[PDB]
Each structure stands twice: as structure tokens, then as C-alpha cells.
Ligand binder design. Structure first.
Ligand SMILES: C=C1C[C@@]23C=CC(=O)[C@@](C)(CCC(=O)Nc4c(O)ccc(C(=O)O)c4O)[C@H]2C[C@@H]1CC3
Ligand SMILES: C=C1C[C@@]23C=CC(=O)[C@@](C)(CCC(=O)Nc4c(O)ccc(C(=O)O)c4O)[C@H]2C[C@@H]1CC3
Lengths: 411, 411
């Protein structure tokens, strides 16, 4: 029976351009939200987001190649390289066939779709770039990374909106456990802070419009919350069959033990008050891991900072945790990072893994005045020290009612 | 050990709006390619495509709901309903939790992305539709269908360009076989015949420009081939654990026995001359099925009608089939249907299943003057009667070098 462990990490987030710098900022309660400057936000209801500061790929992606990729692909490649380098894995002719990728994105190449469509409108189809398609489509991060590293094993890309990162990580694990691969680079990348992303989610009345205090905007479970905050970035993990990791003397961050999925079957852009879908996904991950809810020490929530979304998950956590509900810690790191969409589940799985390593749990900042009837410990304001935490759980839910939960185990 | 069978089929294609009408047209060598009329093609190098004729969803999708969906979603829902109805499955409170969906698309909502971006350019973000995001993103077919049928089991959506349909079908099977579901509606949907789809693939020099004879344009393995022909549609299959199918007295079309994946690790938009990636995917599907290449009777090829793509797959088939290479039948139905992109692997899996049922193999039409050194039987011109064919294989490859092969077994 094949076990799957995590042997490499890579990340670009609004609070840091490496895994460790991002994690340091999160334990310190730092916000990565700021005012947008790369487009004129005068007419936008929302004028801020969690941006990647000073992104740099000069040494990683050639200049001939950069021109062929939307920003989300560039972020995903940089984070994937970070992970592959961290793993220390050496690809060979013998290996290549057993190493793959499961990387996606919720929305993909908004920036270059806008650029190409602007060009088409202005000068006709003659002005569309030859790179239009391969520069925007969701699966292009997996495609570039396999080519860059010579990976010939399975490559897939799951695009399930905000659930993408968890699904891609979960299915990469399944692929290894099934026997179709020994190693997979898995995760998600997103750069939706563009006129269409900001204007589009704004049109749906889904974004916070607290322009006068961008850093207080994302405030999960707080009574004054008014929608999510968009965040850009990428998170990647190298997953690897257990015996293969040891035999090569790999450093092992944690083991991936459970993966659960469900569908709300309720509404396209809102969860049911019940949180029944969220509950079933967590229940499925627990059964997959062979453990009880009481063994979970910390839940990194989907917690996007929407009025109805936050309430549904708190109900689902109550439902699954029952007695232990008040004893498990729950926190939403989107209070600092914003919502990375298709990359959220990927960076958040990293947070869930590091919490195990460091026995430290990042806070839900801005939780000044929690919803009433809430009995849960949302780790408000300040990080929390924990003791013998052996399991963490990461939730990620998405438009379409699609849900996913991952369970990591220490060592 | 859980076996997976196919118990329901649904389809919209350029040669028919049902499964049986489409299959009848294919065995008759009919082309579904025609001149585009829904947009001004004056400035386009390519002015034709395989369109869905007289699409109708009046009785299936409410008018309040249609306005919230790009065409690809509407096609996918109609084909999914066709499949669920064909399966005869009755969803219950007891069942709901064990039935899910794995449905994707290569490019998703081009038409509504263009509409929304046009609106933004013309009148600012105020003019973006509240439905922008949920009307365009790839996972929305799975989302609507789960809500429509009350499906609460796992839902994922794989977007791997032209490989999508095969990946989604293959992973739905894995999900059932793993034990996470007993039933899954799986497939793909695409409607990329828009200014961006036609202009975008045109910019890449990937499309045939034989405007003077649209029906002769798609001509896989023919010396005069000049690129692929874009096709719209959707293909859906209900996959189901074997014992569950029987117990309810389900009609069983075929069993899904093998699923293989690989990556070319070569170039973003072209396969290696070697066809090594294609070969590895087929090799992996055969090993997964536990059979030898000699047991395959018919290969429904990726065969898109590009100069380099068709040659690479013929090399890969030679490589895998060796001695039997000339004895296996290979055909590309894209010679009639055009390239359905993220739905190609889904409709083509249906063709591969029906070939088993009917012991009849559809032709590669337009194969007037085959590439030289080719020794393979590409079923040129006319359908072929077969005798004791027990296994069919369906290939689907995609930009990014991502490959997939499915193997179906009679009964
Ligand atoms: C349908 C309606 C009713 C409505 C009213 C109150 C709300 O809280 C929300 C804002 C957001 C619902 C939600 O969290 N969905 C929701 C969801 O189900 C799944 C995922 C996410 C995510 O961002 O990843 C998400 O955001 C909206 C969406 C919307 C307009 C007002
Ligand atoms: C990179 C270059 C060189 C080039 C020259 C000859 C060719 O045949 C192709 C036309 C198409 C290659 C191809 O089939 N890729 C290709 C591929 O790898 C995977 C999938 C598909 C598909 O449609 O699903 C596909 O189409 C093109 C693409 C392009 C411009 C000319």
C-alpha cells in the first residue's frame, strides 16, 4: 500500500516570495493586501488586492519564453522550480517516466485574454498573438514545468475554481498511490487581479469594497465582513511515494493521509446554510485517513470573508467536530493573504503542513467582533502555540458547489 | 476490486444532436463541417468549422438559467441530461452522496468572455455581467449538472486542452474504482468557434485554411493536410461500478478497463517526431488493462489533421503495435467531426464504445493520398465491418505535451 509524503515546497504569495518568508509573515499576522496600481481603478468598486511584490523570474524563465506566458503561468513555473529545487530530486532517463504534475488554476490567463481581445477589437484577428492559446489556458503551468524538467509521467490540470489547489494535490496523491507515478509536482497558480477579475467578481457582489482600509477588509467570521479579497500567487508541493523518498534520503515535511470530495448540489455561487457539502468533504477526508475528527488539531478554513460562506463552514465544522468543536483550532489565512482562488488550496496546504512542523497556528486577523452564536476557536488576532498536534486539515470550496478537504499527518 | 462500466451516453456533435444520429452519420462518412455564419469571417484566414446545428435546450434549461451560461455549458448540460436519462438511474437521498461528475473543457466560455470584455471596453466595469465568472469557467458544467440532479458526490473538472475528455473519463473511473463514488457523469464540452477561438488558433498557424472546400479540409494522414478543423459539441458518459450497475438492472454498453497518461516534455504546441509521449500513454493504458497491443482491434486516433501531429501518432502506433501494427485498424473521426478540443476525447470515447457494440469502425474520410512510408490501416474512405473485436483504444493529446489513452472492453 503506497503512502504519499511531501518532500518539496514552493510559493509566491502576497506576504512573501518564498515558503519561509511567507510563513514568517503569517505567524506575525502581517497583511499582504494593498491598493492596486497596475490599472486605473477609478471606476471599480474594489480597488485593492493581495499582490505579489517584486516578482522576479529573470534567472528562471528565458526572455524568449516569458513573452509566451500570462503572469499566472510565470508565477506557477517559479513556484514549481522552487519546489523541485527544494526536493533535491534528480531526474534521470530511468526516472523521467515516473514523475509528473497535477497543476491548475481557477481562471487562468486573464491578463493575456484581455490583451488579445483588446488587440482583436482594435485591429482585427490579424492582431491576435500566435501565443494566445498556449499563453492563457489552465494546463500550461504543468506543460512548461514538464518540459523544463524533462518529466514524462502523468500530467493533469484540475480547474475547479477555488477548489483547484486541493483537488490537484489530492489527485496527484491518488495517482502516486494508484501506482501511475512515484513523484508529482502539484499545486495551483492564479493572477486574477485584472480589470476582468476585479470587475467580474465585483459584478457578482462577491468582493469587499472597504477601499479606505484594505488591510482590514478581509475579516472572516467578523460581523462587519463584506466579501472576499482577491489575492494572487502560486503554491506547489512535490508529493512522493514513501519508500522512494527514504531510499534517496529525501527531507520529508509531512505525510498526506486523507482526501475528501463532495458537491453541495445547491446553488452555483453560494453554499447552503447547512454547510452540508463542506461537512461531507471533511467527513470523507477523515474516513479516507482512517481517523476521527477529534484527532485533528487545526483546520485551515476556506473562510473567504463572505457573509454566507463563513457561516456555512462554521456550521459544517460544528457538525463534524461535535463535542471537540471548541477544542480544534480553526483559522483563515485569507485574513492576511486574500483569496488566491485556484492557488488558495495549494498555499493553504503548505500552511497546514508547516503548522505541523512548527507546532504553531497562524491567526485569523481582523476578527474584532465575531458572529454571535459561534462557539469555535478561530484563533483570532495572534498565532497560537500547540503541543502534540499530529493532524491538520485544509478545506477549499468553489463556485459550482464543489468541495475538497486534505488531511496531513506529522511525520 | 471494483470494475467500471458505461451505462449511459449523451452527445451533441457537428454530425448530430443525439448519440445514435451522430453514430449513424459517422458510419456513413458524412462531414459536419460548414461555413461559419454567426460572425463576420471576412478578415479570418479560416472561415469554417464543425458547428452544432439547431441546438435546442428549451425543455432542459429554464430561460432564467440560460442567460447565466456560455454555450459550452448549455451544450454540456444537454448532453449530460441525455446521458443521465439514458442510464435510467434514479437518484435518492441514499444515493446522492455516491454519485458525482468529472466534466471539463479545454478553453471554456469564449463567447461570454468576449461579450463581457467588449462591454468593459465600451462602458467600463459597470457593464460587466454579474454572471461573468460562473458563466465562463470550466467547471460550471459539472456544477449545474450536480445541482440539477442533486448529486452530492465528488465533482472535479480537468482542463488539459484536447486531452480533457479522456482525462475526465479516466479519473472518474479511478474515483469509482478507488471507492469515492459508485457513479460518475464524465465528459467534456466545448464551443470555441468564436472570433478568439478561430482567430487564436489561426494566429498559431494551427488551422486548415481550405475555405473553398470545408468538407475536404480535415484530412488526417493525407499529404495535402494543412491543420485542424475546429468542432463544437459535448460528449458525456455515465460510468458506474459493476455490481451497482447489475443490481439495478442497468443496460451496460462496455467496460472501461485501462487508462494511461504521459507527458511529451518536448514542446508546448508540437509533439516530438518520435511520438514517444503518445507511445508511453498507450503503453500505460495497455498495462493498466493487463493486455497486449495485439488484443486491440481499433484505435480511435487523436489524428487532428496537422502535418507533424498526424506523423507523430502514426510513429507511436507503429512503436506500440510492432508486428500487429498493420492488423489493428486506426481511424480519425475528426475527418468528419472536426476537433472538439476538450470534448474530443469524450465524443471519441463514445465512438470507441459503439464500435464494440456494433462491430463497425468509422472511416478516416478524405484520405486520398496518404503520407508515404505509412504501413498502417487508417480505414480510409469507408466504414469497416469487424468480427470478434473485444477491445478498442481511444487517444487524446493536448497542448503542453499532455497525453491520455483509454481502453474499452466489450461486455
Ligand atoms: C449568490 C449570491 C448571494 C450572496 C450573498 C452573500 C454572500 O456571502 C455571497 C457574497 C458569497 C457566497 C459565497 O461565499 N459563495 C462562495 C461559494 O459558494 C464557494 C466558493 C467561494 C469562493 O470565493 O471560493 C464563494 O465565495 C454572495 C454571492 C452572491 C451575491 C450575494
Ligand atoms: C509549433 C508549431 C510548428 C507547427 C508545424 C506543423 C504542425 O503540424 C503544427 C501545425 C501542429 C503541431 C501539433 O499537431 N500540435 C498539437 C499537439 O502537440 C497536441 C495537441 C494538438 C491538438 O490540436 O489537440 C496539436 O495540434 C504546428 C504547431 C506549430 C505552428 C506550425
Amino acid at each position: 500500500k503506497r503512502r504519499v509524503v511531501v518532500t518539496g515546497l514552493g510559493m509566491l504569495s502576497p506576504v512573501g516570495n518564498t515558503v519561509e518568508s511567507t510563513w514568517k509573515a503569517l505567524l506575525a499576522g502581517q497583511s499582504g493586501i494593498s491598493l492596486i496600481d497596475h490599472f486605473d481603478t477609478s471606476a471599480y468598486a474594489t480597488k485593492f488586492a493581495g499582490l505579489v511584490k517584486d516578482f522576479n523570474c529573470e534567472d528562471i524563465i528565458s526572455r524568449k519564453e516569458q513573452r509566451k506566458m500570462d503572469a499566472f503561468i510565470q508565477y506557477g513555473i517559479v513556484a514549481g522550480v522552487q519546489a523541485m529545487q527544494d526536493s533535491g530530486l534528480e531526474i534521470t532517463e530511468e526516472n523521467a517516466t515516473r514523475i509528473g504534475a497535477a497543476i491548475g488554476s481557477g481562471i487562468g490567463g486573464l491578463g493575456l485574454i484581455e490583451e488579445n481581445h483588446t488587440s482583436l477589437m482594435n485591429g482585427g484577428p490579424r492582431k491576435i498573438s500566435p501565443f494566445f492559446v498556449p499563453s492563457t489556458i489552465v494546463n500550461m503551468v504543468a506543460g512548461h514545468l514538464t518540459i523544463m524538467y524533462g518529466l514524462r509521467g502523468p500530467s493533469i490540470s484540475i480547474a475547479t475554481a477555488a477548489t483547484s489547489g486541493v483537488h490537484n494535490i489530492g489527485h496527484a496523491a491518488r495517482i502516486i498511490a494508484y501506482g501511475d507515478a512515484d513523484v508529482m509536482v502539484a499545486g495551483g497558480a492564479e493572477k486574477a487581479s485584472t480589470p476582468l477579475g476585479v470587475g467580474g467578481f465585483g459584478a457578482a457582489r462577491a468582493l469587499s469594497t472597504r477601499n479606505d482600509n484594505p488591510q482590514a477588509a478581509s475579516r472572516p467570521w467578523d460581523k462587519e465582513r463584506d466579501g472576499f479579497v482577491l489575492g494572487d500567487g502560486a503554491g506547489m508541493l512535490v508529493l512522493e511515494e514513501y519508500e522512494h523518498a527514504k531510499k534517496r534520503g529525501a527531507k520529508i515535511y509531512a505525510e498526506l493521509v486523507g482526501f475528501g470530495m463532495s458537491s453541495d448540489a445547491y446553488h452555483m455561487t453560494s453554499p447552503p446554510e447547512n454547510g452540508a457539502g463542506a461537512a461531507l468533504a471533511m467527513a470523507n477526508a477523515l474516513r479516507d485517513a482512517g481517523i476521527e475528527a477529534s484527532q485533528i488539531g487545526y483546520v485551515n478554513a476556506h473562510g473567504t470573508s463572505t457573509p454566507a460562506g463563513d457561516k456555512a463552514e462554521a456550521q459544517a465544522v460544528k457538525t463534524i467536530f461535535g463535542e471537540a468543536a471548541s477544542r480544534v483550532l480553526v483559522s483563515s489565512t485569507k485574513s492576511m493573504t486574500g483569496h488566491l482562488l485556484g492557488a488558495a488550496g495549494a498555499v493553504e496546504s503548505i500552511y497546514s503542513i508547516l503548522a505541523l512542523r512548527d507546532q504553531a497556528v497562524p491567526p485569523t486577523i481582523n476578527l474584532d467582533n465575531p458572529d454571535e452564536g459561534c462557539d469555535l476557536d478561530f484563533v483570532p488576532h495572534e498565532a497560537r502555540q500547540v503541543s502534540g498536534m499530529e493532524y491538520t486539515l485544509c478545506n477549499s470550496f468553489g463556485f459550482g458547489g464543489t468541495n475538497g478537504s486534505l488531511i496531513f499527518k506529522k511525520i
